[PDB]
Amino acid sequence: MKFGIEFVPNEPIQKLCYYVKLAEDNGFEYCWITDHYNNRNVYMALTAIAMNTNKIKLGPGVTNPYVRSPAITASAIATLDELSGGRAVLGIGPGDKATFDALGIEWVKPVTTLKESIEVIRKLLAGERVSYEGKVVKIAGAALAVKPIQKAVPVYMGAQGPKMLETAGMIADGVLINASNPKDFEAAIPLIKKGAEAAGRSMDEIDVAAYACMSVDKNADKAKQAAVPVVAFIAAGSPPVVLERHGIDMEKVEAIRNALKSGNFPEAFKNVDDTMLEAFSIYGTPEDVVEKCKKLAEMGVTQIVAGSPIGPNKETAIKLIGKKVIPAL
Amino acid sequence: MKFGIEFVPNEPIQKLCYYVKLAEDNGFEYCWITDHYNNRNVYMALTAIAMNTNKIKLGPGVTNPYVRSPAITASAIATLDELSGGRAVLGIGPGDKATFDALGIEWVKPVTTLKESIEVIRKLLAGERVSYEGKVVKIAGAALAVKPIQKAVPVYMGAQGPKMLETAGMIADGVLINASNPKDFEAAIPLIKKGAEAAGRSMDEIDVAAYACMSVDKNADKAKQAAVPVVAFIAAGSPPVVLERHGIDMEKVEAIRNALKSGNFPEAFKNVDDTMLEAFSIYGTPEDVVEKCKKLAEMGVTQIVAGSPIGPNKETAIKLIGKKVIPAL
């Protein structure tokens, strides 16, 4: 089992560089940085991280086709790959309507746009002069001067829905699924396989990654309490099918929704229950978390991403995962 | 007279960082990095430059509203300003049709779009929650979490045309004019002044920058020969009015145009003449260049940007400008 780590660049970049180097020292193999217009710029953060690291793979987790031209995304990735000596990965998903509403961007045909953007990005990274008359993406004579070090930079698709999961099976090197529980992967991974089989691919060529809420502490209950804020947001944002799959109490989900939309975070967290914590986070002592990670592997997960909060104290939790979780997996 | 320096990030970023640190050591006050999708990413380059420098102001020269959301541009600038301790500058212009044709981007109302984008970027950088119903740019509830250190990051507009120059006079902190000869500023600066007066502003609040082709060498003729390739491109791309102002031989301009569009650089360079070099570059010994810079200051130029080639050898020329040009001005 390979481990990744996820951060929002919402603190000074020097602090983030400390966390990622600490993660590298502790045997994490992937560093995923979120890409939201309101925070520190993802590629500037990744440049600093590359300068402070040596071996960990790193990239946006995830960017999207809309906030920058896919041609800009390609050369940003090539730049990262050069600086890092061949360690770049491209995490890319469809984005979200709330963001694009605020920025005045039309969310055109997200599944098609993501596929066409990935094809164009890969052709540019391969050094091709690109003429591409897509249904959405239209390129006429574009060519990079900047070149990656890797022959093919791996592309990980953010995928939550069936059509996106099947598309990832056909074209992606990895899949970032926002889930933490085996039931979710029992359902998701067959859809990826359907796409792999349609494309004549083996699942061996696809890294199925759990983009998980993780909270690890020597005290199981402190780990549980630290996962509550993130789980509140995950439950509030979960589609019906996910809430049905885990038997979540919908009246509690509505209480969380109302509290979050007025910013009453204490009130929202009051409504998180044990069912929600077991469904939407990997939490507990190291021994607890190792067992949970094993049951995800049994469903076909091949990368676990230690996502927020990581633990009650991120510094402490990164070290504890490195000493008593990663070596066991 | 303040000095800037311009680079294309078309080599490994470490080499660029050496040049910019060398420029800082030699008394340059501004560093302008070009923003084109085919090269290394401008903000990744600027991050590395910021880490290798201390005092020089730095930013894109120039970005545009189209290749990234203006909200992304705002947080990229804020991120740069934070990393650099308050040294960011935002160079921004309209872009160009050739690029946007290749990327599938419609070049909507260049002057209006640039004005609205600047207004939005400034409101975002000021910490405002932005609802902006522009003729082109439409923002609904966007807000940054990242903050610059400067209260107002200076905005320099790239401006070549009359409407853009007048707009820059009304709204910009500085103007980047792609010209090297006093005749061009004699014509341009009154248009900026027209806008400043319409907005009730003093020209004291506007840094008029000559975004110049510069070539300095202890041997005047080596300096002249090093300027030929850039001057060939400037002459080929100049609007009629500029070629008319300098009495350029249009037949040589056409020979240059045909050679460049087939990539015959030797043939294009054969057609560059003394008239073109005097009109489109600041070249010669340090003594020559000092006098030429003084005649630009007399027209109202307050920053000279040492643009490509800088000299026959960039390292040698940066040092020579620092020792025998900047101190004299």
Residue numbers in the entry:
A (entry chain A), B (entry chain B): 1 to 329
Authors' text:
Methylene‐tetrahydropterin reductases catalyze the reduction of a methylene to a methyl group bound to a reduced pterin as C1 carrier in various one‐carbon (C1) metabolisms. F420‐dependent methylene‐tetrahydromethanopterin (methylene‐H4MPT) reductase (Mer) and the flavin‐independent methylene‐tetrahydrofolate (methylene‐H4F) reductase (Mfr) use a ternary complex mechanism for the direct transfer of a hydride from F420H2 and NAD(P)H to the respective methylene group, whereas FAD‐dependent methylene‐H4F reductase (MTHFR) uses FAD as prosthetic group and a ping–pong mechanism to catalyze the reduction of methylene‐H4F. Mutational analysis of four functional amino acids, which are similarly positioned in the three reductase structures, indicated despite the insignificant sequence identity, a common catalytic mechanism with a 5‐iminium cation of methylene‐tetrahydropterin as intermediate protonated by a shared glutamate. Based on mutational and kinetic analysis, evidence has been provided that all three methylene‐tetrahydropterin reductases have the same fold, similar methylene‐tetrahydropterin binding positions, and the same basic catalytic mechanism; however, the binding modes of the C1 carriers and reductants significantly deviate.
For the analysis, Mer from Methanocaldococcus jannaschii was chosen as only the enzyme from this organism can be heterologously and functionally produced thus allowing mutational analyses. For structural comparison with eMTHFR and hMfr, the crystal structures of Mer from M. jannaschii (jMer) with and without F420 were solved. The overall structure of jMer is almost identical to those of previously established methanogenic enzymes characterized by a (βα)8‐ or TIM‐barrel fold. The active site of jMer is located in a cleft between the α/β‐barrel domain and a helix‐bundle subdomain composed of five helices. Size‐exclusion chromatography showed that jMer in solution is a homodimer (~80 kDa) as reported in the literature (Miller et al., 2017). The apparent K m and k cat values of jMer are in the range of those of the respective enzymes from methanogenic archaea (M. barkeri, M. marburgensis, and M. kandleri) and sulfate‐reducing archaea (Archaeoglobus fulgidus) (Ma et al., 1991; Ma & Thauer, 1990a; Ma & Thauer, 1990b; Schmitz et al., 1991; te Brommelstroet et al., 1990).
